[PDB]
Design a protein around this ligand. Structure first.
Ligand SMILES: [Zn+2]
Length: 274
């Protein structure tokens, strides 16, 4: 066991999934730090250093990292793999990014199984000496992710179908909303320039009042102020922050992808009174 294979990912969700497949034979690090906004991140010379010292770079694609392709042109002789191949996208519904793929595919546990398979294939391709370890680790982790779906689905099924309205800040939850049958309301369709402008707030306030939606949420990498404004003006409670674009730190309450899905579903369910 000389030097461990080095994997660099664009953001923290992929870091944790890949580290579970890598186990003990590779070290996986994320370019972005926990809590950092990932869509419009501005890479630094230090990020270039980290990616250039890697043996493999993983990214989401599907229009998530607006910075990645320009950044990756600075990197020489390091293979890359997009980890969303074979996932059917949901289009963004409005705004300047309307009609392109919504990038947040990992919020569906069923899609996470495809993430796992793509990361496994990339590790086996570029570090074939450890293929048996990657294959064994991916099979074990896929078992855990597959078993995750049923209790989450049952928990959210307790909310009456007509009341399944998921009101968030970024429209980052479209794939979870599809899996578990939620209608989707948001202050902006994808992180970008305008987040919480008028027009956006007014529309969301209208749907909340018409449908008596009981709760609204923010997310961990963006400002909670628009969501709290919406809850102040309506009958909805502020349900707290959901985790989608980033894990917490390792010593925080959302250290893993499994903990992210669990925490987000639990926070939604609590917002609806379980
Ligand atoms: Zn996002």
């Amino acid at each position: 066991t000389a030097k461990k294979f080095k994997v660099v990912t664009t953001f923290t969700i992929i870091q944790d999934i890949a580290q579970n497949i890598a186990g003990d034979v590779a070290v996986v690090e994320s370019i972005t730090k926990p809590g950092a906004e990932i869509h419009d991140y501005q890479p630094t010379p230090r990020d270039i250093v980290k990616a250039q010292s890697a043996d493999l770079i993983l990214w989401n694609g599907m229009n998530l990292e607006r910075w990645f392709e320009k950044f990756f042109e600075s990197i020489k002789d390091v293979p890359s793999a997009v980890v969303t191949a074979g996932i059917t996208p949901l289009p963004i519904r409005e705004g300047p990014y309307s009609g392109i793929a919504n990038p947040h595919a990992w919020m569906s546990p069923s899609n996470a199984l495809i993430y796992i398979e793509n990361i496994r294939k990339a590790l086996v391709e570029h570090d074939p000496a450890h293929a048996e370890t990657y294959n064994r680790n991916a099979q074990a982790y896929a078992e855990k992710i597959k078993a995750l779906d049923a209790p989450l689905r049952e928990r959210l099924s307790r909310i009456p179908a007509e009341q399944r309205w998921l009101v968030t800040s970024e429209g980052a939850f479209s794939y979870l909303a599809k899996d578990y049958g939620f209608k989707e309301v948001y202050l902006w369709p994808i992180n970008a320039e305008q987040q919480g402008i008028p027009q956006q707030v007014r529309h969301v306030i209208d749907i909340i009042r018409e449908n008596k939606i009981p709760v609204v949420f923010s997310e961990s990498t963006i400002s909670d102020k628009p969501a709290k404004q919406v809850s102040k003006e309506t009958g909805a409670q502020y349900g707290g922050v959901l985790y989608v674009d980033s894990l917490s730190g390792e010593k925080g309450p959302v250290p893993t992808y499994i903990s992210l899905i669990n925490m987000t579903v639990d926070t939604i369910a609590k917002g609806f009174g379980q």
